[PDB]
Design an enzyme around this catalytic site. Structure first.
Site, PDB file in Angstrom:
ATOM      1  CG  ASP A  15      -0.369  -0.057   2.529  1.00  0.00           C
ATOM      2  OD1 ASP A  15       0.867   0.206   2.632  1.00  0.00           O
ATOM      3  OD2 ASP A  15      -1.081  -0.360   3.484  1.00  0.00           O
ATOM      4  NE  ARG A  29      -0.800   3.092   4.410  1.00  0.00           N
ATOM      5  CZ  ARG A  29      -1.976   2.474   4.361  1.00  0.00           C
ATOM      6  NH1 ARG A  29      -2.730   2.576   3.262  1.00  0.00           N
ATOM      7  NH2 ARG A  29      -2.408   1.774   5.415  1.00  0.00           N
ATOM      8  CG  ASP A  34      -3.651  -1.875   7.024  1.00  0.00           C
ATOM      9  OD1 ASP A  34      -2.558  -1.361   6.745  1.00  0.00           O
ATOM     10  OD2 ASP A  34      -3.875  -2.460   8.072  1.00  0.00           O
ATOM     11  CB  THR A  35      -1.202  -4.107   1.908  1.00  0.00           C
ATOM     12  OG1 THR A  35      -0.285  -3.012   2.088  1.00  0.00           O
ATOM     13  CG2 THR A  35      -2.083  -3.821   0.624  1.00  0.00           C
ATOM     14  CD  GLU A  37       3.506  -2.728   7.628  1.00  0.00           C
ATOM     15  OE1 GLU A  37       4.544  -2.475   7.014  1.00  0.00           O
ATOM     16  OE2 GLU A  37       2.547  -1.916   7.700  1.00  0.00           O
ATOM     17  NE  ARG A  75       2.550   6.964   5.071  1.00  0.00           N
ATOM     18  CZ  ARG A  75       2.085   5.867   5.657  1.00  0.00           C
ATOM     19  NH1 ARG A  75       2.700   4.686   5.462  1.00  0.00           N
ATOM     20  NH2 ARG A  75       0.980   5.946   6.408  1.00  0.00           N
TER      21      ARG A  75
HETATM   22  C1  LIG Z   1      -4.067   5.467   5.067  1.00  0.00           C
HETATM   23  C2  LIG Z   1      -3.795   6.572   6.067  1.00  0.00           C
HETATM   24  C3  LIG Z   1      -2.900   6.331   7.065  1.00  0.00           C
HETATM   25  N1  LIG Z   1      -2.594   7.317   7.991  1.00  0.00           N
HETATM   26  C4  LIG Z   1      -1.689   7.077   9.099  1.00  0.00           C
HETATM   27  C5  LIG Z   1      -2.555   6.329  10.169  1.00  0.00           C
HETATM   28  C6  LIG Z   1      -1.560   5.480  10.920  1.00  0.00           C
HETATM   29  O1  LIG Z   1      -0.937   6.252  11.992  1.00  0.00           O
HETATM   30  P1  LIG Z   1       0.032   5.362  12.932  1.00  0.00           P
HETATM   31  O2  LIG Z   1       1.447   5.300  12.183  1.00  0.00           O
HETATM   32  O3  LIG Z   1       0.208   6.153  14.172  1.00  0.00           O
HETATM   33  O4  LIG Z   1      -0.358   3.853  13.296  1.00  0.00           O
HETATM   34  C7  LIG Z   1      -0.609   5.055   9.758  1.00  0.00           C
HETATM   35  C8  LIG Z   1      -0.957   3.724   9.096  1.00  0.00           C
HETATM   36  O5  LIG Z   1      -0.141   3.674   7.923  1.00  0.00           O
HETATM   37  P2  LIG Z   1       0.435   2.201   7.600  1.00  0.00           P
HETATM   38  O6  LIG Z   1      -0.715   1.130   7.463  1.00  0.00           O
HETATM   39  O7  LIG Z   1       1.183   2.441   6.316  1.00  0.00           O
HETATM   40  O8  LIG Z   1       1.436   1.987   8.761  1.00  0.00           O
HETATM   41  O9  LIG Z   1      -0.749   6.043   8.764  1.00  0.00           O
HETATM   42  C9  LIG Z   1      -3.289   8.503   7.915  1.00  0.00           C
HETATM   43  O10 LIG Z   1      -3.060   9.391   8.743  1.00  0.00           O
HETATM   44  N2  LIG Z   1      -4.128   8.783   6.897  1.00  0.00           N
HETATM   45  C10 LIG Z   1      -4.437   7.824   5.998  1.00  0.00           C
HETATM   46  O11 LIG Z   1      -5.286   8.055   5.190  1.00  0.00           O
HETATM   47 CA   LIG Z   2       0.110  -1.500   5.957  1.00  0.00          CA
END
Ligand SMILES: Cc1cn([C@H]2C[C@H](OP(=O)(O)O)[C@@H](COP(=O)(O)O)O2)c(=O)[nH]c1=O
Ligand SMILES: [Ca+2]
Length: 129
Positions: A15, A29, A34-35, A37, A75
């Site tokens: 993702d 992103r 959510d993919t 890891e 991102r």
């Molecule tokens: C997809 C997305 C993720 N994020 C943030 C939420 C999560 O915060 P946290 O890092 O504190 O857990 C993280 C999840 O991304 P990943 O699934 O790539 O880790 O990215 C956003 O803020 N907006 C979004 O639209």
């Molecule tokens: Ca992920």
């Protein structure tokens, strides 16, 4: 919403991907998904699926939603299209991603992706297996 050009810089994982947008490298992103890891079950498959889809494409496009365009990590947050097919939806349809992180005001394609999840779940695909 509208589609804008970009070119692949480098696949990262299911993702996230590095694209050149308005001439600047950015990590994107994918909205609303959510993919797993890479080190998790189905993570290697998710990574390969996105990498193949975006690398094989003749044309990459980014589509921002109505709300925030970058997350707290810098991102870009977008729907990404490969030759007109949405990578976000395609991952969900294949059971390689879950609909997730649906924040109001960046959720235009929510219902489209949920319809795809429901069908992956029916078919018991990958994550739903
Ligand atoms: C997809 C997305 C993720 N994020 C943030 C939420 C999560 O915060 P946290 O890092 O504190 O857990 C993280 C999840 O991304 P990943 O699934 O790539 O880790 O990215 C956003 O803020 N907006 C979004 O639209
Ligand atoms: Ca992920």
């Amino acid at each position: 919403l509208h589609k804008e050009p970009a070119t692949l810089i480098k696949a990262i994982d299911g993702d996230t991907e590095k694209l050149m947008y308005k001439g600047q490298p950015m990590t994107f992103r994918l909205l609303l998904v959510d993919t797993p890891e890479f080190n998790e079950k189905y993570g290697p498959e998710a990574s390969a699926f996105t990498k193949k889809m975006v690398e094989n494409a003749k044309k990459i496009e980014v589509e921002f939603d109505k709300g925030q365009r970058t997350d707290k990590y810098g991102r870009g947050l977008a729907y990404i299209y490969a030759d007109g097919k949405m990578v976000n939806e395609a991952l969900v349809r294949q059971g390689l991603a879950k609909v997730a992180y649906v924040y109001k005001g960046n959720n235009t394609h929510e219902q489209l992706l949920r319809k795809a999840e429901a069908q992956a779940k029916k078919e018991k695909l990958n994550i739903w297996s």
